[PDB]
Amino acid sequence: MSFDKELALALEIVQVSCKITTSVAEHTLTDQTQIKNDKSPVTVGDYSVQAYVNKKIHETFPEDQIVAEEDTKTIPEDIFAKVCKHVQIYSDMKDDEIRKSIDLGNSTGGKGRHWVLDPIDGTLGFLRREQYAVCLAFMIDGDIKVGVLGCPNFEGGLIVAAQKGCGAKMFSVNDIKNGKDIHVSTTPKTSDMCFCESVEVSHTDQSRSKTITERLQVTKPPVRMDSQCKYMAIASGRADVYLRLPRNLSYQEKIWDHAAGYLIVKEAGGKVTDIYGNDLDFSLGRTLCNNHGIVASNGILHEETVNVVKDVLSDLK
């Protein structure tokens, strides 16, 4: 019932991952960027981080499985060559071993011990040179035990981490030894609420959120940002509510876009559900099959917010 070892490894690995991404970002990004078949981007950073993390996980916990976003099926040769250079700063692996490490991430989740990795959450944020996160969680039978978010561009570079039952802590990227406890805000009126959402217009319904927040009498403009950093904002008290509003009932969120943030907000004293107020169910594979969208909050504001969300999104198909 304790996961110190897993939380310790997760911190250590996410810290190195932040070094990777930052180092990738010191150069021009276009020649480091691949457009996948769904037109979403993947970079040298995404692939390099995944190689390193998966290898480290496999070295310490060979028996565990790994759910990770990327694979090597379509990766271009110039991109891959750069990937090998970045990884070999931190891990003495050959090119072929780097490929294998990436492809360790093909677990479908569900029963047993699984690591959940988004090597770069908010890759558009990475390309924007504003918020992105390295996200790593560990779960058993779909119950999240450990959550770590590395956010290199957030207020000078921050990492937040939690394990179940033990609270949430904040560290700088340069020091994972000395952390501070963090707690969600105490804001008890929706009118004084700082609300956050995706930058990308196609990742959340920004027209419906305006209508939601208008009904909740929110005075402050929304804080738009890429990534699971939005969960870090909630957990640390920097914002009060995070909305992710779908345009249909068919899209299902990936578990590597929510697993770390979910636990972290809860251990920080907040609340995370979908738009209907239902708890997120991470036991149904790689996607949140039985959930629609996200509402994350400081807990006090939650139900007041959900009630308006549900109503405005009552027409969904």
Q: Which residues, numbered 120-139, are part of the site for Mg ion (CB under 5 A)? A: 120
Shorter beta-carbon distance to Mg ion: residue 19 or 208 = 19
Taking contact as CB under 5 A, which single stretch among the options 82-90, 119-127, 184-192, 211-219 is the one that binds Mg ion?
119-127
Q: Which residues, numbered 34-93, are part of the site for Mg ion (CB under 5 A)? A: 69
Please tell me the count of residues contacting Mg ion according to CB under 5 A.
3
Query: Is 244 annotated to bind ligand?
Result: yes
Query: Is 121 annotated to bind ligand?
Result: yes
Catalytic positions: 46, 123
Is 118 an interacting residue with respect to Mg ion (CB under 5 A)? yes
Shorter beta-carbon distance to Mg ion: residue 17 or 305 = 17
Least Å from the CB of residue 121 to Mg ion: 5
Query: Is 238 annotated to bind ligand?
Result: no
Shorter beta-carbon distance to Mg ion: residue 6 or 118 = 118
- DSSP notation for the chain: ---HHHHHHHHHHHHHHHHHHHHHTTS-SGGGEEE-TTS-EEEHHHHHHHHHHHHHHHHH-TTSEEEES--STT--HHHHHHHHHHHHTT----HHHHHHHHHTTB---SSSEEEEEEEEE-HHHHHHTS--EEEEEEEETTEEEEEEEEETTSTT-EEEEEETTS-EEEEETTEEEEEEEE-------GGG--EEE-SSTTTS-HHHHHHHHHHTT--SPPEE--STHHHHHHHHTS-SEEEE--SSSS---BGGGTHHHHHHHHHTT-EEE-TTSPBP-TTSSSB-TT--SEEEE-STTHHHHHHHHHHHTTT--
Query: Is 253 annotated to bind ligand?
Result: no
Q: Which residues, numbered 253-282, are part of the site for Mg ion (CB under 5 A)? A: none
Rule CB under 5 A: which residues touch Mg ion?
A: 69, 118, 120
Q: Which residues line the annotated binding site for AMP? A: 198, 203, 227, 230, 244, 251, 257
